[PDB]
């Protein structure tokens, strides 16, 4: 297996459309990826099925920005639309509320309630089916994308204070809006009836995502990126 340990938190259930918010302080060092994303599980299987995914990824070499993306097409022939958005304070220096909205008509990205991207059109028409909400922390082998991996910066931690998921309820949300809050997880514990911890990896990722690196402490869920064999979190959870 691999020489580093990362983590992936994922909802056990997938949904069709919705609004998803996560209050997070992201991880960043050259070479890392710290994310929030919607994912249709199995998209990675190259049997001809479609790929359905929407991303927020902080690329470690540039902590003051995040990359947005929609991945459609299919495995081995993806259609993407990478864009970048400034975040202030930098993503690894403060908590921000990251939002994703996905409806039949558009996908929208927000930071602290402010829109940073809204996409319509072809890829949106191909985000069919369901997607679960996921968060992961890893390191990409593409130095051009994330920077050379600086192992001396390990361990790194991504903190998730809370998550809110809203159902798509067109014209029936508060004040005629299109979403209605469905559930909130404040992360006082790891709720195993709601979430799973990933134990797998993929090509281009130099880490094994492992359940060893998801921690529950002081009201937050913590994802860690560590050298293999150094899986621990003995720091202080930041205040939000
Ligand atoms: Ca290195
Ligand atoms: Ca909390
Ligand atoms: Ca697992």
Curated annotation (Swiss-Prot):
The active site is at residues 53, 57. It catalyses: Hydrolysis of (1->4)-beta-D-glucosidic linkages in beta-D-glucans containing (1->3)- and (1->4)-bonds. One of its GO terms (biological process) is carbohydrate metabolic process. Keywords: Glycosidase, Hydrolase, Repeat, Signal. Its EC number is 3.2.1.73. It comes from the Bacteria. Residues 2-171 form the GH16 domain. One of its GO terms (molecular function) is licheninase activity. Belongs to the glycosyl hydrolase 16 family. This is Beta-glucanase. It comes from Fibrobacter succinogenes (strain ATCC 19169 / S85). The chain holds residues 27 to 266 of 349 of the full protein.
């Amino acid at each position: 297996a691999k020489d580093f340990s990362g983590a992936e938190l994922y909802t056990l259930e997938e949904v069709q459309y919705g609004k998803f918010e996560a209050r997070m302080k992201m991880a960043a060092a050259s070479g890392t990826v710290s994310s929030m994303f919607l994912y249709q599980n199995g998209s990675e299987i190259a049997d001809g099925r479609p790929w359905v995914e929407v991303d927020i990824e902080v690329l470690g070499k540039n902590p003051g920005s995040f990359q947005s993306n929609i991945i459609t097409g299919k495995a081995g022939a993806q259609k993407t639309s990478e864009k970048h958005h400034a975040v202030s304070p930098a993503a690894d220096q403060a908590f921000h509320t990251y939002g994703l909205e996905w409806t039949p008509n558009y996908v929208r990205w927000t930071v602290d309630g402010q829109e940073v991207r809204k996409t319509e059109g072809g890829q949106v028409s191909n985000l069919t089916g369901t997607q679960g909400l996921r968060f992961n922390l890893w390191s990409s082998e593409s130095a051009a994308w994330v920077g050379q991996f600086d192992e001396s910066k390990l361990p790194l931690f991504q903190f998730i204070n809370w998550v809110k998921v809203y159902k798509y309820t067109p014209g029936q949300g508060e004040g005629g809006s299109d979403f209605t809050l469905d559930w909130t997880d404040n992360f006082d514990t790891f709720d195993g009836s709601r979430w799973g911890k990933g134990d797998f990896t993929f090509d281009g990722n130099r880490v094994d995502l492992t359940d060893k690196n998801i921690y529950s402490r002081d009201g937050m869920l913590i994802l860690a990126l560590t050298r293999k064999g150094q899986e621990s979190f003995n720091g202080q959870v930041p205040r939000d």
